[PDB]
């Protein structure tokens, strides 16, 4: 499969998540995603075909994971935006107030601004600390998807937020949204990964 930020993948033929970013670890291809999407060794599928397995994850506490893929996968330095693409250029972290977009299989590509950093989410499973908060909306299924600036600087992967009864936070005003993402920087150094860029 072509690996692009924001596309859907399933875990052990049950849950759905979105791809964060294409990465490499020496000769191994992978993608970074949310830790809550799977457990180590869980199987990831793209369009019904097995593409790899969870190699590592941390959740709760943090919310990160990387899936090592088979040799046959095509890693691309891109994030889905409808039928178009946003080129990944690096991972400079943006500051509070910067505009940012996120891409995922449930709400598509949504944009907004970063509102706060170092936020704690108290999920049923335990707290997740150090999340960055933006006001782009998102829905169930968007987890693990890419957070990126229009200039192509990757910021992190979708963790969670204040989902409403309709499964997303898109029918409430930006001012009331809490959409949280795990910072990419610490995931790259923790697993020794390099971002694929173009």
């Amino acid at each position: 499969a072509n690996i692009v930020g924001g596309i859907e993948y399933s875990i052990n033929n049950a849950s759905l998540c979105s791809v964060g970013f294409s990465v490499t670890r020496g000769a191994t291809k992978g993608f970074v995603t949310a830790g809550h999407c799977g457990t180590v060794n869980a199987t990831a599928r793209i369009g019904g075909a097995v593409v790899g397995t969870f190699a590592a994850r941390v959740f709760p506490g943090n919310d990160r994971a990387w899936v090592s893929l088979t040799s046959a996968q095509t890693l691309l330095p891109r994030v889905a935006n409808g039928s178009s693409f946003v080129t990944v250029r690096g991972s400079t972290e943006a500051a509070v107030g910067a505009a940012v977009c996120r891409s995922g299989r449930t709400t598509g590509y949504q944009c907004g601004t970063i509102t706060a950093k170092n936020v704690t989410a108290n999920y049923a499973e335990g707290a997740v600390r150090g999340l960055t908060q933006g006001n782009a909306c998102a829905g169930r299924g968007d987890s693990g998807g890419s957070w990126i600036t229009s200039a192509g600087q990757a910021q992190g992967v979708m963790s969670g937020g204040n989902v409403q009864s309709n499964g997303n936070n898109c029918g409430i005003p930006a001012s009331q949204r809490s959409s949280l993402f795990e910072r990419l920087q610490p995931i790259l150094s923790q697993y020794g990964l390099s971002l694929v860029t173009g």
Partner: peptide
């Protein structure tokens, strides 16, 4: 807040 909930995961996603």
């Amino acid at each position: 807040a909930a995961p996603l």
